[PDB]
C-alpha cells in the first residue's frame, strides 16, 4: 500500500507529513493526467521545437489538471517508510469545465472517480500555497524526475504562478529553472541510450519493472517513473548523471 | 484573404529564418475534441485573428467571445448550438463567419451590424422560410445582413417614451415640542450589485438597463434626490464603493463606512473587486463618527458546549453580512448623546428560515454587546444608547425573522426554526419557551404603507426595513410607494426597469430623537 489517495478533505494533513519526508528523500518523480489536448496553433514558427512549446502553451492555459502523482525517494533509490507515493486528485467539473471527449473516456477506464472529484476535489489555488510553504519546489538540492514532462511541468507552473504560460519559449525556461533547479527528463536520457523507444509502459518491459497500482493512472505512473529512473541510471549511465548535459532538458523542447 | 484550407502548421525555412531570425507570429488557432464547453482563459487571447471551433458539441456561446476585437474569422460549423448571443454585434472586425449544420432557429438582429462580413455560411440550419429565401438570392449575404439590421430598428433600444411620476411623501406624526428634540432623515436601499444582476434572474430587463454603468448613474441620482442625513446601502461591490459611491457622495457632504460580506476567502484582486457588502453614510454637518464595527460572532460568548458547536456548524456562514457605526450629534445643527446605526443583508432564501432566523438573533445579540461597551466610558451618566436599524432581511412581515424584531422576541417552536425548534442552544442568545432581547423596536413603515419593497416578476414583498427604539425614537414621516396605477399604465412586470435601477425600492423615512435638559 505504497500509493496514497489525496482528496481535499485529507489534504492539509498529508502536507504536514511530506514536509518532514522531503528532508531525507529529496528526489521526486512526477506525472500528471490532464483532459487531453484540444488546441493546435497554425502559423510560421522559428523551429519545430518552437511550435512544440506554443502547442503546449495553449492547452496548459486552456485546461485544468485532473490528477497528480509524486513519489519521494532518496538518492540511493529507496522509498520512505509508510506511503511512498501521493496521488493528488483535483477539482474538475464535468459540466462547466472544458475537455476532449476521448480524453475523458480513457480516464474513466483508468478508474478516476470523476463525480467524487467534483464534490471532494482539491482547489488548485489553495494547493499551490501549501506546496509553496513545504519547500519541495525552489530549494537547492531537490531534484526532479519525469517522463514526457512538457505538459507535466507545464501545468505545475500555471498552478504555482496562477497565470497563463509566458509567450516567449525563453521566458518559460527561466521560470522553470527557479522552482526546480535540477530536472532530469527520463525520455531525454533514453535518447542517449541504445534500444530504448516507445511509451512508458513499453520501457518498463525492457527494464523488467513490476507495475503497482492501476495502469495509466497519474499516481501509478509517477511511481513507475521514479523506479525506472534509478535502474536506468545504474544501467546505462553508471550510477551518475552529468547535470550540465542532461539537467534542465525536457523532451520535445 | 482566404484562410488556407489545409489546417496544417507551416515553418519558416531554416537557412533564411535562422540568419534573419524573425519571430514566430501565429495568428490562427483550432479547437477539436468534441468538447462540451469553452474556457474563460480562451477569451484572453486578444491577438488571435482566426478561430476554428468546427465539429464540436458546443451548446451555447459566451458573450465574452467579443473580447477578440482583432478576430477577422470564425467557424462554428457542425456544432450543437441553439442560439447566438447579442454581444456578437460588437465584433465589427469580423469579416467571415460560418454557422453551418447547427440548431439555429433565427439569427440575432445585432448580427447585421457586422458591415465587414463578406462571406457567411448557413447551410444545415432550421431558419425561417423567408431567411432561406434571402440567402438564395444573388448577393443574398449582403441582403440578409441589411434585413437583420432593419429588424434591429424595431427593437429601438432606449426609446424611454414613458415618464416617471414622483413618489409621494406621507406624514405619520407632527414633531412634538414639549421637550427639545433632534430630527434626522434615514434611507435604506439595496442597489442590486452587478455580480448578481444577471438577465437569467431579471429576464424582463433589457441588457442595456442592467449594465452597471447605466444603473450606477440612475442610482446615485436617487440617493442625492432624497438627501437623507443617513444612507444605508446593501449589495455594493467593494470596487464601486471606494471609487464611485464614496466619491460622488462626498461632493454632496457624506462620509461613509464599508465592510465586505466575506473576508476569509483571500482570493485574487479580480475576485475581490466584485465582492459586495453593506455601507453606511451620513452628513458630517449633523453627525460625527465615534466608532466603527463589522459584526461577527465571538463564538465564545456562549457557554462552551457540544450542542452549541454541533448547532452553529449547521447555521454559521463565513460571511459576516453586517455593519454598524456609532455617531455623535454636533452641538450646532455638554450631554453628548450618541446613536448606533446598524445595517444588514440576509442573502439566504425563504426556505432556509432557520439560518436567517438564528443569524438574525446572532446579529442583534452582538449589537447589544457593542452598545454596552460604548455606553460605559462614553455615556455621560449611568445610560441608554438608541438604535436606528435598517436591513434587508429577505423576510416578509409575517415571518419569524421579522417577528423577533418587532415583537421583541420569538417562540422556541416558531415554524421558521424547522429542525432547530427547541434546541437548547437557541435559548442562550436571549438576554421558558421564548427567546427575548432587551431592545424594544418598531418598524418605520408599519401598517404596510409600501405594499412591497422588492418588485420582481416572481416575487412581490416587503423585505427591507427601518427600525428604531420606541422609548427614544419616533417617526414623523415616510416616503410612500410609487403610484401603483403608473406601474400598470406602463406594463411593468418586475424590476429593475429602464426607469427603476434596482430590484428593491428605497426607504426614506424621517425620525425624531428626544433631547433632555439643555
Ligand atoms: Mg501520464
Ligand atoms: Mg438582491
Residue numbers in the entry:
A (entry chain B): 10 to 262
B (entry chain A): 6 to 338, 350 to 398, 403 to 451, 459 to 545
Authors' description from the paper:
The CCR4 and CAF1 deadenylases physically interact to form the CCR4-CAF1 complex and function as the catalytic core of the larger CCR4-NOT complex. Together, they are responsible for the eventual removal of the 3′-poly(A) tail from essentially all cellular mRNAs and consequently play a central role in the posttranscriptional regulation of gene expression. CCR4 belongs to the heterogeneous EEP (exonuclease-endonuclease-phosphatase) family of phosphoesterases, whereas CAF1 belongs to the DEDDh family of nucleases, which also comprises PARN and PAN2 (34,35). Consequently, CAF1 serves as a bridge between the NOT proteins and CCR4.
